[PDB]
């Protein structure tokens, strides 16, 4: 497997180069927001981001080695965490605001348009703020995002040998993160402290995903906005 033979620098470069582009929203400034039209915009955006995500995942070292079933399962588990960590990353330099798109920058009061969304906004805002205070670097961000992809569904799996392969790749991404922190000049103690802070943030991202999944499902069952067939099936994957 080509992935385990990568150097740390080669792991970073490949991840930086596989980054999806920042997409624009269908935001129309000629009309006011309603709950339905705000959700329409976000869902439409998310739907387009997903197609770029699927192709990004194919470029994450080790991901192609898995069977189609395992690939499907990992993306079904992580997709919303991955959209959220992107959003938080984009929003870093915009205190108090979430940059869904370059033409869609929203503060928490614009979140209140949608029943129950301001709570999610608040959590995303606080995470963006945490990344800002930590001075998260892009190289660290793409490692984290790749960790989410491989980790979030791995506990819900000779498919034990592929499960072992995923754990090997995760160890390489750990080595990569540490390599980056050392190269930035942090002491050894700062390295493993910083490593822990970043990974513990992944628990909060999981949390946000799970609360987000629950609100999207309730909106789907109230017909607030039409959902693409793809989004329906991804949402379906979390059903219980």
């Amino acid at each position: 497997s080509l992935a385990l033979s990568l150097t740390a620098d080669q792991m970073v470069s490949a991840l930086l180069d596989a980054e999806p582009p920042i997409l624009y929203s269908e935001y129309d400034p000629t009309r006011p927001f309603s709950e339905a039209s705000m959700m329409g915009l976000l869902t439409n955006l998310a739907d387009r981001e997903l197609v770029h995500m699927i192709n990004w995942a194919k470029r994450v070292p080790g991901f192609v080695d898995l069977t189609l079933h395992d690939q499907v399962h990992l993306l079904e588990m992580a997709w919303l965490e991955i959209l959220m960590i992107g959003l938080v990353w984009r929003s870093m330099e915009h205190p108090g605001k979430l940059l869904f798109a370059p033409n869609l920058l929203l503060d928490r009061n614009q979140g209140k348009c949608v029943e129950g969304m301001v709570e999610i906004f608040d959590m995303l805002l606080a995470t963006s703020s945490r990344f800002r205070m930590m001075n998260l670097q892009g190289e660290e961000f793409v490692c984290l995002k790749s960790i989410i992809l491989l980790n979030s569904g791995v506990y819900t799996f000779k498919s034990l040998e592929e499960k072992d392969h995923i754990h090997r790749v995760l160890d390489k991404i750990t080595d990569t993160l540490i390599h980056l922190m050392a190269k930035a000049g942090l002491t050894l103690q700062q390295q493993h402290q910083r490593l822990a802070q970043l990974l513990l943030i992944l628990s909060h991202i999981r949390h946000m995903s799970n609360k987000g999944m629950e609100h999207l499902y309730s909106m789907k069952c109230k017909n607030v906005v039409p959902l693409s067939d793809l989004l329906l099936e991804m949402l379906d994957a979390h059903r219980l």
Partner: peptide, 10 residues
Amino acid sequence: HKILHRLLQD
């Protein structure tokens, strides 16, 4: 047969 499954092939 899932859309996701199809899209992962390209």
